[PDB]
Nucleic acid binder design. Sequence first.
RNA 1: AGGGGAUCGAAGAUGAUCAGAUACCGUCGUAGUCUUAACCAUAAACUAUGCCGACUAGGGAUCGGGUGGUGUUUUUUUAAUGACCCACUCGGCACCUUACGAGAAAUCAAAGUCUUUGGGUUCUGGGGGGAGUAUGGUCGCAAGGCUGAAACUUAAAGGAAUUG
RNA 2: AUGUUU
Lengths: 25, 81, 150, 96, 87, 121, 97, 206, 217, 129
Amino acid sequence: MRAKWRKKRTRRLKRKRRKVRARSK
Amino acid sequence: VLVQDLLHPTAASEARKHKLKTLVQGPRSYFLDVKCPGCLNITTVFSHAQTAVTCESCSTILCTPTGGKAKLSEGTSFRRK
Amino acid sequence: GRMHSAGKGISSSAIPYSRNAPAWFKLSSESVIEQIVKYARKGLTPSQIGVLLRDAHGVTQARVITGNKIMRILKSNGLAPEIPEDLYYLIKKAVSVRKHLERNRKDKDAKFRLILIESRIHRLARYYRTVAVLPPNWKYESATASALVN
Amino acid sequence: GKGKPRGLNSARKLRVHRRNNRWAENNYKKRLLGTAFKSSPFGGSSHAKGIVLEKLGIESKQPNSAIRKCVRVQLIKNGKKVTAFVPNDGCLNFVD
Amino acid sequence: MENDKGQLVELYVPRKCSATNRIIKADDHASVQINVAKVDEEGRAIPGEYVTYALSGYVRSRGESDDSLNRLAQNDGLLKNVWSYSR
Amino acid sequence: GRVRTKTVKRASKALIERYYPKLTLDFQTNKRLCDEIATIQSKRLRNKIAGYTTHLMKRIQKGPVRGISFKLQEEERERKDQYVPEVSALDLSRSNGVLNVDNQTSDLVKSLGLKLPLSVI
Amino acid sequence: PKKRASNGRNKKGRGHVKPVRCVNCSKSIPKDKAIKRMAIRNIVEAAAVRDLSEASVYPEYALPKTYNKLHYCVSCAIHARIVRVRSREDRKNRAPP
Amino acid sequence: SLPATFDLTPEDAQLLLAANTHLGARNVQVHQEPYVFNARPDGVHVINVGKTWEKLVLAARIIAAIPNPEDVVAISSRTFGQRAVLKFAAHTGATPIAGRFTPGSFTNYITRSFKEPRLVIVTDPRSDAQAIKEASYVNIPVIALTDLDSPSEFVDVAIPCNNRGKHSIGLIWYLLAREVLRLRGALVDRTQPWSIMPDLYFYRDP
Amino acid sequence: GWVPVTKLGRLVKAGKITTIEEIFLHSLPVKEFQIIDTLLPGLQDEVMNIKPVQKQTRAGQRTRFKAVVVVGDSNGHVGLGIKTAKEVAGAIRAGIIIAKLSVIPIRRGYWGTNLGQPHSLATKTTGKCGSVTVRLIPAPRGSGIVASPAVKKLLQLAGVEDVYTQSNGKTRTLENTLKAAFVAIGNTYGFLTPNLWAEQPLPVSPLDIYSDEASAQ
Amino acid sequence: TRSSVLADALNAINNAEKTGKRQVLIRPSSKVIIKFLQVMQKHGYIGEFEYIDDHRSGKIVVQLNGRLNKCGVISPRFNVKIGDIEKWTANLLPARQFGYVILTTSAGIMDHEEARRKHVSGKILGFVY
RNA sequence: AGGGGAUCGAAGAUGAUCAGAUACCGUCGUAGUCUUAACCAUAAACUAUGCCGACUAGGGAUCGGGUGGUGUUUUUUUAAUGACCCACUCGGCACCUUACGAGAAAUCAAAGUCUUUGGGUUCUGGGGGGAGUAUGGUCGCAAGGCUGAAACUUAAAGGAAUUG
RNA sequence: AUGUUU
Ligand SMILES: [K+]
Ligand SMILES: [K+]
Ligand SMILES: [Mg+2]
Ligand SMILES: [Mg+2]
Ligand SMILES: [Mg+2]
Ligand SMILES: [Mg+2]
Ligand SMILES: [Mg+2]
Ligand SMILES: [Mg+2]
Ligand SMILES: [Mg+2]
Ligand SMILES: [Mg+2]
Ligand SMILES: [Mg+2]
Ligand SMILES: [Mg+2]
Ligand SMILES: [Zn+2]
């Protein structure tokens, strides 16, 4: 995969992880 | 080349080199005795004078500052010492 | 060179090899000293004193003619300023830049130049404090910069 | 210069820079972090006893063939489960 | 390079360039040896009698062999007003 | 096309390089001695070689051509000399018995030679 | 590797150059990189010059020219053959043909 | 060290000035030529014909030092000097190379070629660069007729002269041959003008 | 026979030049291997390696064979020849020819005192070919040749008996390593030591001393 | 800025020697430079050199004779013990028979041979061979 | 968050192609594009070449300043500047040739003055992935920025160049 | 203008 699109997919994954972690406490 | 007299370069070459890049650095400027419209003194004026030098006992301009050497008001005489 | 720039300019004065007064110079050492004191009492800094001396008179270097530097002559005759000449002009430049910044507030270039000028001021003041020219507690303050030069 | 301080009084910076850059070596980093003790089921030991859990046929990677007849073994020391190859022609009948 | 009891143990004491004093190597094929025939009694170019100059391949490659040979010849005679120490 | 190949051109060239005091510029007598001074294995090739030799001989009499050196080009090169004889080497003529040079050339001459007719103007 | 000794553009000591749009495809290309060709054509190209000189009411009209600077991107210049792929040594030749 | 007979006489001095050897290259000149007399306006430089004569004499002595005359090879690919080198190798025993040098003449010992000179003289170093390169491959000293803008690389003896003028080129080659013959002994006295005129070396277009 | 060309070869056949030291002194270019054969009769050769070089062309694998050959007697002389040919035997023979043509002198010296028959090099020397750098350091007696097998073979064919070697770069490139070692060996006579400072009278070349050996009668 | 005038002088000398020049102008030509040049001249690696006394720090013109393979400084000026002089000579010089490691010692600037026959040591300054 | 919002235009809507084409192409078109006041601090933020200092080839252009000329041209009334030419010089953007030299080579007046290794100094890298991920800290309104592993996995990945 | 895998 293009490195830019790998970075974008990783950023989306990081955002999803941040959301799922924030929902827990 | 590979062989030359670094201690006795030609006077033409030394006059061609930059004032700092000569064998021993020295000023290429000088002083002039400007013939004043008055008397009692001959004013000494730097060649690269940054000032608009006036006569010692008068108010006439002897030179006008420029980037390098100064002007001479277009009426003057000047001895080069 | 150009401590706060990319320039490599070498333009500077190339004083003559001779440490003695020129032959064509006939004015007395006491006379040129007296003219130096007259200019200083008229309020000229050593730089402008030397400029006038070499432009309108024939004195080439006050050190080679009178055996003493202009600032040293002024200090010996009690005309030395509170702060050195170069520091005073650096502070004045900083004051001008800051006064322009107050009225512009968008000149990021002026802000950058003010930072450069103030860094130069602080380094020069550190040197002067080290050599005890300024008091050891001397501090340059932007809020009091103008009151020190006017 | 060569990109490093040469000054006679720069020994502190030289040794600190060397200390920082030694972390990029695998052996040094593993030794200083003690990776073998935590990871590496053999807890920094050459050999380890275990109890055989299962005979498995692990197919060799390309371009090869000939599944290798390994065994899943639970180590007595720490209970971790590892796979061990049984090297000889046969010799899987020699383990149960 | 001699040994104890002072006998030459080294082969091929090499020649040296007359302009740079560096060794002319055996594989220095850009180097040149120049013989200038001696003149006796208004010419006649006595054969087998020369003034000999060695010029290194480095000098010849740098294109200073002409100036160096002018200087060396004028130093040895052979030339009167070509090369000047000041320039 | 009627372009001649190597085996014709080179053979004709060699035939000239070794048989110049020999066969003239007529093909009929050029092909005859080819049989005795060359072992050609086909009459068509012999005719081709003889024809190119004839052409080369016909164009050799009007100026030497490249790659033909039969030990007579040097003799003719020595015989043909002195294009413009008996008039001058461009010395002491074409002027008022002087050299029309510049002032800087005048100083060049006065450096060492004080005896030279100069018309520096 | 680095194909061109300076770059595929002309920018040294500049840093940034404002872009221009390719006349063929409208691609944004820096002005120093765009291929620039001046087209100075007769209004009547070659064939109807005689017809327009005949139909003209003015003797010796001296018909005008159309001037147009064309800025091309690299892809469009190569496709339209304003410039062509050159040999490695021929690339180091800035003189126009 | 050379006796008084070897200095530049007025006859060959005015010969050089007539053939325009002193008209050197334009204001652009290789910065390895101290043979330059002060530059005249219109760009043309003045070559010191005295230095030209002394360099010519030194080159002549170097040629005379060669034991076998055929070991001297004179090279000129330019048309202006082909006849000059042919005359030089006709008078002296040198080996001529007029026109193409056939690169590989000093290396590459294949026939029709492969002379082994002990000295090579070239009319123009720029047009005969290949010969100079091969000489630097096989240790061959080089004399070159060099203008003020001629390359000095692998040029052991430069003779400063106008290499644009056919008269200057032919006269320089003629003087080289004459001095070589005088040193060898073919010309018993070096005071006679060597009656055979220096037009045998000039090129002829018609 | 020989029937020489390249008049240096004619002189060598005629026996006017009897040692290769004169050729080295006058930097005479050598073009025939028979000169080296007649001047160094005891010149033993060794094939360092033969490797196939392949050119891809229309199913490819042109697969020519390149041979590296080191020739030399173990007294002061080595040559290195690298040559490619269609066949291994021809590549080896042409490599031997090229190595003989490339034979150069080596300057042996003393590590310590002047006890005769020098055993080491006069100075440290470095040669570089490709990325490989080979440095030869003088070593005390009995050290041997501390070098990799190929460089050690080249040095022992050069006659060095005690030397240290240091190598940098991809030394597994045997051709580059051997060329670098050859350059380092050759630099021994290009390094100017104080014991070579004394001026020499610049002797006359044998091509001038015996000049009547270039003609065709 | 300028940090070692001796380093600048020796680098200029190296560049002139390796370009084949027989003379080299070095500035500002300090006393350490003068002493180093005097050691090189005493050991015959350089010829006559002129100190040009401008009323600045000065200049020097050195005459080179082509016997200098390499001159260089060791920066920093490492302290060298008598036992470490041998290690420095082994590292820097091409051979044990020639070449000189130059030290600044309290007995003066001198080559390692003079230093070890005076039984003195100090700081390493450079090398010449 | 205000103002402005012509044009183009992430999104979205659509027409056509395609096997599918909510892609390329076409028509609209929101945010944006513009500006003020605050954030953000990231780019192939590139010359993929840190900064200061010295030295080592040649050359012609060009920008700015200066110096000189029996200089050409412009008028004020001697001259002067203005523009231009020639030469030199300092500083700058670069360029051409050659490289003693350097490099793996492409190429490089620096990427040279390095095994003949040391002018001063800052930062960064240690096979390829995992991974600029997890975690902690910190900054941000957010998007994210800075700092940053490990387990595990792999014999290559990669650079330049050659021939097909 | 387009034409998918090995
Ligand atoms: K298999
Ligand atoms: K809008
Ligand atoms: Mg500076
Ligand atoms: Mg700074
Ligand atoms: Mg590519
Ligand atoms: Mg940018
Ligand atoms: Mg499409
Ligand atoms: Mg970044
Ligand atoms: Mg970067
Ligand atoms: Mg890694
Ligand atoms: Mg690749
Ligand atoms: Mg497949
Ligand atoms: Zn386009």
